[PDB]
Amino acid sequence: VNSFSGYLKLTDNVYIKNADIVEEAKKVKPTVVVNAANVYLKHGGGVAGALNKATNNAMQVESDDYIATNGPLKVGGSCVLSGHNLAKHCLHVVGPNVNKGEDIQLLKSAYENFNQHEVLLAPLLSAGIFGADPIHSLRVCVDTVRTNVYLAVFDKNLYDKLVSSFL
Ligand SMILES: C[C@@H](O)[C@H]1CCCN1c1ncnc2[nH]ccc12
Ligand SMILES: [Cl-]
């Protein structure tokens, strides 16, 4: 039993809700919140910009130190940093950016990072400003993640479409 509430169940291990991930995180304070990061951990907009803003820029300060020490992430890769006031940990995951010509096959590699954590609150990856089709992102998620994932979908119309077309 966990404290996530109001989710539709898609499969044994994937749950979905029309919600702002920032609000879900503040309410639930999960062990892991996933950020839709870029390789530079520059949290400018979308999920990352909103999460960082909710931390009063502490996420960005921590991230800049991470990059100064370690260099950029790989597309498809991840790192575990603090969750600040939103969660115990933040798993920063880089999906491919289709607007940059990055290989959509890397979306599966991105989702594989979720399997290192028993339970996560997450957005769909590579959608939003990253350019990919959220319907495809959901199928990759369901077919790749085996741990328990609670997906927060910001837009109501998209949420309704993802549920209605789910095979
Ligand atoms: C797929 C879509 O859901 C992702 C990509 C674009 C924004 N977005 C978000 N999802 C969940 N919570 C959010 N809070 C703020 C933004 C946001
Ligand atoms: Cl985004």
Domain 8-163 falls under CATH 3.40.220.10: yes
- Answer whether 15's CB lies under 8 Å from 24's CB: no
Q: What's the CA angle centered on 129, arms 124 and 132, to 5 degrees?
A: 60
Which residue type sits at 120?
A: L
Domain residue ranges in the chain: 8-163
Kindly give the distance from the C-alpha atom of residue 36 to the centroid of ligand 2, in angstroms, as a whole number: 6
3-state secondary structure the chain: CCCCCCCEECCCCEEEEECCHHHHHHHHCCCEEEEECCCCCCCCCHHHHHHHHHCCCHHHHHHHHHHHHHCCCCCCCEEEEECCCCCCEEEEECCCCHHHCCCCCHHHHHHHHHHHCCEEEECCCCCHHHCCCHHHHHHHHHHHCCCEEEEEECCHHHHHHHHHCCC
Residue minimizing CA distance to atom 5 of ligand 1 = 128
Q: How was this structure determined?
A: X-ray
Which residue type sits at 63?
A: S
161 alpha carbon, closest ligand: 1
